[PDB]
Ligand binder design. Structure first.
Ligand SMILES: *C(=O)CCCCCCCCCCCCC
Lengths: 215, 40
């Protein structure tokens, strides 16, 4: 399906999942959210835009916050992803996040992922990634990064809510900000603001991508 | 109080009479595209 790309970096894959080991040779994987999974990832200009001012309150403010990052640019690196998450799933559990990126440039990149409540940072995961040459480009992979305990707790609490509409009510004030940076130059390669609802679709998890624009 | 309190977050929806979280404008009331609320 649709993914996100700036001039310097393309995110081809993103997934968060729960993997259960039934026995040493049998694994069951449930995807909560996914980009570039059920169909090959792509990027094209047929994107619609969202006024970034409409979402500033849902993300960290001040120096290094969303407004500061957007103002510093480049504007073509900024996206809003809405996920309709698939929460229908059941020691031997592993909660993971995987992602993959491509660039024409050989860089050392840093990926900062901030989980936010009412626009306030609760936890941050920071990962450093080196390039691998592949089919005429450089690839970067975060493979099966353990989901932090806050998110495991959050998902447990969500599933313990008696009604699905309650889950949506909680999700309205839960956001994730992903900022991928060239470590040396500090250039913003990708900045993705994530917003969530629960999926009601028979096909499971879904996503919509929007460009973020000034007005 | 603390805005990042995970228990308070969920208590607000489970037991609305005791909700102690920031009040906000629901996404559905904001100037956002129609697609934003219609899954594909
Ligand atoms: C802890 O390490 C924070 C890093 C967060 C990674 C993003 C995972 C995306 C969460 C999707 C689950 C959906 C729950 C509604």
């Amino acid at each position: 399906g649709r993914s996100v790309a700036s001039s310097k970096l393309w995110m081809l894959e993103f997934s968060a999942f729960l993997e259960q080991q039934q026995d040493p040779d049998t694994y069951n994987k449930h995807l909560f959210v996914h980009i570039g999974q059920s169909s090959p990832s792509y990027s094209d200009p047929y994107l619609e835009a969202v006024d970034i001012r409409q979402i500033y309150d849902k993300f960290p403010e001040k120096k290094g916050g969303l407004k500061d990052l957007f103002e510093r640019g480049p504007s073509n690196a900024f996206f809003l992803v809405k996920f309709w998450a698939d929460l229908n799933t059941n020691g031997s559990s592993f909660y993971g996040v995987s992602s993959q990126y491509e660039s024409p440039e050989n860089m050392i990149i840093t990926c900062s992922t901030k989980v936010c409540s009412f626009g306030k940072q609760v936890v941050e995961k920071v990962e450093t990634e080196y390039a691998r040459y592949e089919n005429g480009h450089y690839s970067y992979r975060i493979h099966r990064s353990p989901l932090c305990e806050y998110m495991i707790n959050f998902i447990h609490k969500l599933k313990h809510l008696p009604e699905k509409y309650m889950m949506n009510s909680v999700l309205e004030n839960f956001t994730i900000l992903q900022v991928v940076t060239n470590r040396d130059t500090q250039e913003t390669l990708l900045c993705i603001a994530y917003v969530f609802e629960v999926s009601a679709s028979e096909h499971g998890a879904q996503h919509h991508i929007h460009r973020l624009v000034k007005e | 109080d603390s805005e990042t309190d995970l228990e308070a977050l969920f208590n607000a929806v489970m037991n609305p009479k005791t909700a102690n979280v920031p009040q906000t404008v629901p996404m559905r009331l904001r100037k956002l595209p129609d697609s934003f609320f219609k899954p594909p």
